[PDB]
Design a protein around this ligand. Structure first.
Ligand SMILES: Cc1cc2nc3c(=O)[nH]c(=O)nc-3n(C[C@H](O)[C@H](O)[C@H](O)COP(=O)(O)OP(=O)(O)OC[C@H]3O[C@@H](n4cnc5c(N)ncnc54)[C@H](O)[C@@H]3O)c2cc1C
Length: 450
């Protein structure tokens, strides 16, 4: 059918829904048009082989105040990731060492170099900020050198560089360090409130939502009722000065004063725009791309590692699995691990059979926490790259040199067309907290003009 609303919202991930929520609060009418048969986009709770698993985004850090606010406003509660006992570090040389502490048990040299790099990243993020990295006088220099090359420029120590890289590269951008810029690294750190925050997993991986993160979008959408349309990919946006018409599958047609495109940048061109967007959007959008990470879930009879006095945390820059954490659900007696294979290493695992990939990842888990890890009861791999309405994970980021060249244009509305996703956020960049922020900023920006 066909309908009028003040704002048409394309995509019902946490960013779009957040916008829809805030717009309704201000007495403005919305239609949220979603491609999938569900809401929540890159967040998604589902039962696989009888195990409740968080396929997408799931964690909540203390600096994520927009989201903490929304959580409390929607009546959802949180809980700590388990953290008692020792973490496991696996060196460049493949040596596994248990440790407690805020810093990795490397030799002194690497330890000092790490600390110098953490401080140096903290200072650059404090000076540069997550709001407009591109506008800082240091932006050009920082954004035309890869994070790889920058680290080489700063430190002679292979292992320290690799370990710093782990936190940004496989940690947040899920692209290799040779493919994004020092500026982009800085911007990541600023968005979490600092690099030290990215380093301490007790911070960035603090808490989860009882009921899973998808509940955040499900609740916002339940409150929107018939104004949320599922199974409706948006194909065309006709627009002008006064407003737009959004066409979607199942003969849907929304006429509105403003549009929010609440989809990750790499999918903007999935929609035909009549007339075509300006040259600048045409170019900038090509330079944006998602990372790749396999998010691995293994479920065990008990959380077995806790008996050996381990926390379930592992870090290993040179391992096929780079991070692992305890991801035992609230009140579950079965133990659950979450592990990550990133960028080029995810490619390599995807090049193997489903069966040979699982053996290889499980062997890696085994090198962290012992051979009981090769005996899971449920095993599952997240696969956002295969999904036509995502195409990777966790976030889209500019190619090398893209951020300073295009950054300032990335949120600018084009006539009635607005843009909101976590991939272009300031604080919370790439995280649910970002999606929520961008949605709310988009709504406010729309309110102020109307
Ligand atoms: C494996 C993985 C792990 C993650 N880990 C963390 C974490 O633990 N902590 C954290 O906070 N976040 C993390 N993230 C990232 C986080 O999930 C996202 O950044 C956040 O969900 C962004 O949401 P969004 O609203 O901006 O976009 P999305 O969630 O992608 O929403 C976009 C929506 O748009 C829809 N859509 C796209 N095109 C169209 C179209 N043409 N027509 C109609 N609908 C369309 C899609 O179907 C989707 O529902 C994780 C993400 C992944 C993938």
């Amino acid at each position: 059918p066909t309908l009028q609303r003040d704002v048409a919202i394309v995509g019902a991930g946490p960013s779009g829904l957040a916008a829809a929520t805030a717009l309704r609060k201000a007495g403005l009418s919305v239609a949220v048009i979603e491609a999938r048969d569900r809401v929540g986009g890159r967040t998604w709770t589902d039962t696989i082989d009888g195990a409740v698993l968080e396929i997408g985004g799931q964690w909540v850090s203390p600096d994520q105040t927009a989201l903490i606010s929304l959580l409390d406003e929607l009546g959802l509660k949180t809980f700590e990731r388990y953290r008692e006992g020792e973490s496991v570090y696996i060196s460049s040389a493949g040596e596994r060492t248990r440790y407690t502490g805020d810093s990795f048990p490397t030799n002194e040299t690497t330890k000092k170099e790490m600390d110098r790099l953490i401080d140096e990243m903290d200072d650059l993020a404090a000076q540069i900020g997550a709001e407009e990295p591109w506008a800082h006088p240091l932006a050009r220099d920082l954004d035309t050198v890869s994070f790889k090359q920058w680290l080489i420029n700063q430190s002679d120590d292979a292992e320290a560089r690799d370990n710093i890289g782990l936190f940004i590269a496989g940690g947040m951008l899920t692209k290799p360090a040779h493919s994004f810029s020092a500026l982009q690294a800085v911007l990541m750190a600023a968005s979490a409130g600092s690099f030290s925050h990215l380093v301490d997993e007790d911070f960035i991986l603090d808490k989860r939502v009882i009921g899973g993160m998808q509940q955040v979008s499900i609740r916002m959408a339940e409150a929107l009722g018939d104004d949320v349309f599922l199974n409706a990919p948006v194909r065309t946006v006709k627009w002008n000065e006064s407003g737009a018409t959004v066409l979607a599958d199942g003969d849907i047609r929304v006429e509105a004063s403003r549009v929010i495109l609440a989809v990750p940048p790499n999918l903007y061109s999935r929609i035909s725009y009549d007339p075509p967007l300006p040259r600048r959007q045409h170019q900038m959008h090509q330079h944006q791309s998602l990372g790749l990470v396999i998010k691995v879930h293994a479920v065990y009879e008990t959380p077995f590692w806790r008996e050996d006095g381990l926390s379930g945390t592992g870090f290993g820059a040179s391992e096929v699995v780079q991070e692992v954490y305890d991801n035992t659900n609230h009140e579950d007696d079965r133990g659950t691990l979450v592990a990550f294979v990133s960028d080029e290493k995810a490619d390599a695992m995807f090049e193997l059979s489903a069966e040979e990939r699982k053996a290889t990842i499980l062997a890696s888990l085994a090198r962290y926490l012992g051979p009981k890890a090769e005996e899971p009861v449920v095993y599952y791999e997240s696969d956002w790259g295969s999904e036509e309405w995502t195409r990777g994970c966790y976030t889209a980021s500019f190619d090398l040199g893209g951020l300073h060249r295009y950054g300032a244009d990335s949120r600018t509305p084009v006539g009635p067309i607005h843009f909101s996703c976590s991939d272009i956020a300031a604080e919370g960049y790439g995280h649910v907290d970002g999606a929520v922020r961008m949605g709310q900023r988009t709504a406010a920006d729309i309110i102020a003009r109307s």
